[PDB]
Symmetry: C5
Subunit: 205 residues, 5 copies
């Protein structure tokens, strides 16, 4: 406990928090999705509710330490409130997102952080055709709300959404599920914005 | 990170927060709306739910800096809780507004601030006729709850509500959508109050 | 900004907060209602939902200042959390009251405070007869939860509820709406309690 | 204000906050219920919703003062967050309890505290027979979650639930309503736990 | 009070909080369930809601004391916010878990902590067959969200879920209810992970 208390103290009480990335010191955030269930489809409002886990990873020089200085501690867990986290948001949500898991991150001595919030999201999706063989496709994208591509870049480790924890007795069968990095330009802004587009095709039964 | 940490420290830890505008030092806030979806219409209570983004912009002398003094930083992102924000509210809401996006603002070296909260709002609207060709019109206005025109003035950059992110498969088609600055007088107060009236005409299909 | 910062500092950081009224220094609170809409009537549970604004006014010697000492500032706005506010509550609510407006008060150099929270309230009301010509009457009273008439007295400026912002396309037509000071005696306590009874008669169409 | 400010200051500065009772210094808490309405009955889930006020009273020697030392102040009001409160809870709730009143307590110069939260509670009750002449009986008990009878004892001033503010036009007529101190033994623990059982018999009309 | 105030001060104000377990100083958490009611079954979304109490127990050296040094105090109660608690969570929840009890723990002089949050949980379960004689079985597992078996080991004192507080008039009869420790290795990770699987078989009537 003593070494870990000392490490945490040195990292969090002896320097200011990371103020976030800039053009001169950009940050890459890696993002993948584990889809656990499609829990609700509402055809009168065109809303669909998912439960999923959002794997986020990034790295900061300010979170590095030498394990030999701290009794060979190579990683630790800490409340997400103790560290900077990126402002990744769903772009087509219809309700505030509901957090289903403790808000705790894993920090490793090379400065890398892993944060995996489980969440329920309501989003815009017309589910007409969900009860046919072809099913229906919807999409929702995730990205920084206020940082451009020049400050926060996103990547994925894979194009396939992790379906290995998908609820075996869901009302809905997943026909396809992809996660794809996209570069968007909007008319407002000259800077590109980066998102990951989660596209899920699904049907009943 | 070092220059940005120093800038933030100089701005936020070395003087009190801006106490808000007065008659002697008024403020102009620019306001525009991006309508993303009409998500619910309830004819038994005359409530309609929108999801929209509220672009807000204003400028403070107390947020200015010379980029040459701070490693050429010309702007940065910061939690909206670190700065004064204006008390703009919907005047005919029926439920507390639900915030859908991180509460983070962009501050620029000329002292200008941009804040773009995405929100779900329930408001008073009789939707009778929504299922006809003519559709139905409702309106909701937005302005400061407690500052008059002598302290906070509003303007818009345009009269047209931004419909470029409107959900392509909404239950509702937008026939018209305007945002108009208006001057209101209340019996309580001799000073005029300023609002922006969001008038949306829409129908099913 | 400098004068206002100095005033706020002198008022709030240089003495303790007002600890509330006592028998020796009672306080009069003025109370008036602006009824904006009857948003819901539920005959299966006997609940009715209103949206209204509650004008509250009181005066404290400890909030006085000479405008000549503070660059001629005669009033300012401040977060309701910076000041004492009275514990006025609805006595027949069925859900926590939902605040619809920013919680900001106006303080004037004579020590008077104006606070106007907009609210949605669910309360006990049997709406049988709402769909007839005679309509239906319900009532809900508002007063301090724990201060007796010896500490907090209530008055109204008028007996008529302000209907000038009542939603023109409500499901419900207001036949009558009054606000009336009353004295209540409880078996527990020898001291009378003061409330304002809001009585609204209404019907459909 | 001055004497009261001084009293509050002196009481805040006497010790840390009361750490709660122990075997060596137990505490008796007095408990009574005012039943305001039965607001909802759900026979598909066996839930019933009540609105009631929970009178709680206890006494601490550390909160005593001589009124002659403080300009004859014999009592004052203060936020419930400024003092220790007991952990009395409903034992068969199905939803978090909703607080309907300001969280303010009354402290008296003999060290007694009165706290009267108004609340809406959903709880386990099979309402079969509610629509007959005999009606239906349900029960919910209230006690400390973690203090045994050796640390917190409960009493009631009366066996009869106060029905004097029961809503005159409720869907439900109250046939009987009692509050009875009981001793419960759990298999986990050798110590008895004390609760007050609120038993309400009621029917429609 | 005096001795207890001194003990709490020595434990909580004189050293940092426990930073959680590591490979070098692991922790065992004991876990058991008291099932109070199955409150809702939804076959259109495959969600089931339970109300249960989650008994958690662990031990820390940093929470030990000699009772002779503190007026023979052998245990005390304290807000769960004063101490580290483990991040045990349901792995297939569909909603944020609702806490139904005060968040207070019992600490004993040997450093052991008992924490018993009562909760309402919605989780993934297909309730087809609930209305037959055989009934239906569902399952949900609980474990640390971020600590492996090398940091947090889980055990149960018994395989049987405590049914002694199960609501006598539930819609649902419990045919079987078990809690079983399971040790997993996943391909992603070299560390073993531990969960407790709560398996409940039930039917109507
Ligand atoms: O709409 C604007 C916008 C409009 C006019 C000026 C500016 C903007 C930028 C922020 C600075 C300058 C951000 N956004 C949105 C925030 N988020 C959602 C879409 C865009 C991009 C990412
Ligand atoms: O009702 C009052 C009011 C009443 C009596 C005195 C005063 C007021 C002002 C504040 C100044 C002094 C604010 N308001 C509301 C705030 N907002 C909504 C309606 C009005 C105007 C715009
Ligand atoms: O029940 C009591 C009560 C009981 C026993 C002692 C005392 C009380 C007072 C507070 C002082 C002393 C307030 N109340 C409630 C708070 N509010 C609503 C109902 C009553 C009256 C006004
Ligand atoms: O289950 C236990 C329990 C189990 C093993 C040890 C201990 C307990 C006590 C706390 C002290 C030591 C409290 N409780 C619950 C909390 N509350 C409700 C049910 C009981 C009784 C009162
Ligand atoms: C901190 C820094 O790099 N500042 C540069 C510096 O070259 C100069 O002040 C100017 C160009 O003359 O542009 C900027
Ligand atoms: C600081 C400031 O603005 N002061 C002036 C003051 O000189 C003048 O006497 C008053 C007129 O009544 O108006 C104001
Ligand atoms: C400050 C104050 O109120 N002091 C009063 C005093 O005038 C009175 O003589 C006494 C007995 O009644 O109680 C005390
Ligand atoms: C302050 C205090 O509690 N002192 C006690 C003492 O009186 C008692 O006889 C003994 C246990 O029997 O432990 C110690």
């Amino acid at each position: 406990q003593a070494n870990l208390m000392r490490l945490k103290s040195d990292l969090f009480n002896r320097s200011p928090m990371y103020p976030g990335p800039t053009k001169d010191d950009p940050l890459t955030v890696t993002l993948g999705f584990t889809l656990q269930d499609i829990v609700k489809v509402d055809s009168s409002t065109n809303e669909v509710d998912l439960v999923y886990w959002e794997r986020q990873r990034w790295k900061l020089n300010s979170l590095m330490w030498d394990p030999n200085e701290y009794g060979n501690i190579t990683d630790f867990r800490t409340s997400a409130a103790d560290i900077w986290t990126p402002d990744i948001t769903a772009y087509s949500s219809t309700r505030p997102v509901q957090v289903l898991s403790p808000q705790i991150a894993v920090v490793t001595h090379d400065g890398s952080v892993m944060f995996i919030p489980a969440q329920r999201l309501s989003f815009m999706c017309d589910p007409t055709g969900v009860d046919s063989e072809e099913g229906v496709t919807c999409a929702v994208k995730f990205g920084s709300w206020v940082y451009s591509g020049f400050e926060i870049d996103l990547k994925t480790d894979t194009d396939q959404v992790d379906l290995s924890s998908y609820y075996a007795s869901s009302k809905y069968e997943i026909l396809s599920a992809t996660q794809t990095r996209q570069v968007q330009h909007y008319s407002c802004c000259p800077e590109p914005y980066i998102d990951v587009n989660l596209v899920v095709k699904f049907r009943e039964r």
